[PDB]
Amino acid sequence: EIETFYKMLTQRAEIDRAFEEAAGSAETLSVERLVTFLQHQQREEEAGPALALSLIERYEPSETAKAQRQMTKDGFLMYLLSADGNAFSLAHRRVYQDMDQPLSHYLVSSSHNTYLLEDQLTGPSSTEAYIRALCKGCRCLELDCWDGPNQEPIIYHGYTFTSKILFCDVLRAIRDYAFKASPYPVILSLENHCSLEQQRVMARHLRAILGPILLDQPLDGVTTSLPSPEQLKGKILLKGKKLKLVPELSDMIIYCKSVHFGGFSSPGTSGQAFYEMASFSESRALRLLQESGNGFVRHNVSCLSRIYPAGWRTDSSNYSPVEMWNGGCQIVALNFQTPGPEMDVYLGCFQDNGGCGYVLKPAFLRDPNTTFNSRALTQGPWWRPERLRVRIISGQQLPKVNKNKNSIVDPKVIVEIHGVGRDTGSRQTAVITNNGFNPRWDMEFEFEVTVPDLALVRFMVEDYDSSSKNDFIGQSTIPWNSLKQGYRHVHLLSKNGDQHPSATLFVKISIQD
Numbered sequence: 001e002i003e004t005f006y007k008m009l010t011q012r013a014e015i016d017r018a019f020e021e022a023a024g025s026a027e028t029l030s031v032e033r034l035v036t037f038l039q040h041q042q043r044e045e046e047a048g049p050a051l052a053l054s055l056i057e058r059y060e061p062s063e064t065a066k067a068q069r070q071m072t073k074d075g076f077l078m079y080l081l082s083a084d085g086n087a088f089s090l091a092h093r094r095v096y097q098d099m100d101q102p103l104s105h106y107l108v109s110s111s112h113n114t115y116l117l118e119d120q121l122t123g124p125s126s127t128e129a130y131i132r133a134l135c136k137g138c139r140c141l142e143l144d145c146w147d148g149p150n151q152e153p154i155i156y157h158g159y160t161f162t163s164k165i166l167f168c169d170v171l172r173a174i175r176d177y178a179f180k181a182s183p184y185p186v187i188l189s190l191e192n193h194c195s196l197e198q199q200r201v202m203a204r205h206l207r208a209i210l211g212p213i214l215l216d217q218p219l220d221g222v223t224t225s226l227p228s229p230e231q232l233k234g235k236i237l238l239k240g241k242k243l244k245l246v247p248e249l250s251d252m253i254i255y256c257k258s259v260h261f262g263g264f265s266s267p268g269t270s271g272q273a274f275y276e277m278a279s280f281s282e283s284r285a286l287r288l289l290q291e292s293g294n295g296f297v298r299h300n301v302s303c304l305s306r307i308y309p310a311g312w313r314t315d316s317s318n319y320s321p322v323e324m325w326n327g328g329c330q331i332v333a334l335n336f337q338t339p340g341p342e343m344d345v346y347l348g349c350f351q352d353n354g355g356c357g358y359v360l361k362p363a364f365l366r367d368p369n370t371t372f373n374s375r376a377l378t379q380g381p382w383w384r385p386e387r388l389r390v391r392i393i394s395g396q397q398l399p400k401v402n403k404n405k406n407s408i409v410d411p412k413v414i415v416e417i418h419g420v421g422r423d424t425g426s427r428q429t430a431v432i433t434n435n436g437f438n439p440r441w442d443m444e445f446e447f448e449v450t451v452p453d454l455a456l457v458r459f460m461v462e463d464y465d466s467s468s469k470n471d472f473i474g475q476s477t478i479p480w481n482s483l484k485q486g487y488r489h490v491h492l493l494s495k496n497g498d499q500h501p502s503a504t505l506f507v508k509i510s511i512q513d
């Protein structure tokens with residue numbers, strides 16, 4: 001009763017149902033049975049007793065069954081809720097890719113007016129903002145340098161009422177956090193509006209503060225291509241205009257000389273040096289992608305492109321990064337302060353590869369001769385249609401999203417596919433009235449994804465409201481290739497990207513060519 005209660009408040013048929021099918025009539029899961037489950041349902045590659053044991057040794061609560069190499073319903077569950085049963089591939093949650101290719105081969109985690117905490121017009125600026133981004137994995141940061149009093153350069157949003165901060169104060173912060181989240185290179189995109197004197201001051205602060213972390217001299221060799229994230233480990237590079245501009249600073253720009261976009265070389269041999277990087281607004285970028293998709297792509301193979309939000313985004317809202325990534329753009333800057341699907345997607349992408357901040361682009365986007373163009377799809381390696389079926393079974397302990405009262409959520413789930421325009425899709429379950437503890441949907445959806453190497457799957461849970469707009473409850477974005485198959489739990493994050501302790505979705509995923 002009070003036994004039954006807890007034993008009832010804690011009673012997940014879907015789980016039972018699942019154990020049964022795998023366990024058949026037995027009360028436990030023998031290795032043999034477990035392995036079968038891993039192989040047939042969880043579609044594991046390394047499927048084999050070796051793994052089956054690891055799971056048991058890891059997750060089986062019972063000493064008997066543990067010792068006897070068996071799994072109980074409980075252990076089944078524990079596994080299912082563990083990092084091993086996460087829909088986001090536990091293997092992808094550690095640097096596991098080739099970190100030896102030129103920077104231009106990786107998508108880099110970048111931010112826009114990083115010093116900013118809110119809007120672009122009158123919001124506050126803060127070192128905290130750089131700390132948060134760095135903590136969220138960001139690698140490329142933006143500093144808007146302006147002359148300040150007492151000959152101390154400051155950082156704020158030029159021509160607006162945004163709060164100010166000190167360039168040096170910011171450098172220290174960057175100094176301390178640059179590598180907390182990753183050992184990979186950090187790029188400082190300087191936007192210099194400083195008098196030559198103050199520029200000299202900056203240069204000093206840079207060396208004085210960054211000291212040996214600061215990369216102020218080209219790498220030995222590193223002649224025809226940008227160095228790789230590896231060769232640049234634990235270093236901080238500068239990006240800006242290179243010779244109004246004092247040599248002290250200018251001399252510091254080595255691999256990221258800020259340039260005005262010329263055009264895409266194609267109608268010739270070159271255009272921009274590998275060490276030249278152009279920036280494009282969200283608008284201009286779309287244009288070039290619309291007209292010269294392959295143009296860009298091929299360009300982005302050996303060069304780094306930066307893209308930032310359209311000027312009308314004074315609310316610091318963000319655009320969809322996918323569109324840019326689809327063009328091979330690597331430094332897609334967003335307002336990291338952002339809650340919203342855009343950052344949700346952005347941070348899900350970068351969750352991959354151990355969250356080191358550098359994610360290797362697909363091969364076709366690393367092929368200088370590619371004929372790819374996400375806007376004009378033709379047969380090619382990138383073309384690999386797949387069938388995705390996601391069953392939204394139930395949800396567990398959905399967080400009571402900020403209701404100024406004692407009402408119960410009326411959850412519903414949205415599953416979206418982000419990728420090339422053609423693959424983009426979205427579907428939703430029905431609403432479950434007044435249930436956040438254990439809503440049960442048991443609904444399934446199917447998607448056809450033609451260019452999976454560019455897709456991401458997003459799970460979003462909303463608190464339905466007849467009247468007003470539904471409250472966001474939680475979300476999770478998994479890159480296509482990190483999407484684990486079978487029975488898994490989706491671990492929901494807050495709008496701030498925070499991990500909700502017991503908030504999950506239990507789903508069943510299958511991907512078939």
Ligand SMILES: O=P(O)(O)O[C@H]1[C@@H](O)[C@H](O)[C@@H](OP(=O)(O)O)[C@H](OP(=O)(O)O)[C@H]1O
Binds near residue numbers: 157191
């Ligand atoms: O939103 P903001 O504060 O205006 O800055 C953006 C842009 O309008 C500004 O003009 C650019 O600098 P730019 O004037 O040197 O082109 C910065 O890009 P960039 O430093 O990569 O070029 C962008 O991040």
Ligand SMILES: [Ca+2]
Binds near residue numbers: 113142143
């Ligand atoms: Ca700026």
Ligand SMILES: [Ca+2]
Binds near residue numbers: 407408410433434
């Ligand atoms: Ca309700």
Ligand SMILES: [Ca+2]
Binds near residue numbers: 465
């Ligand atoms: Ca409601």
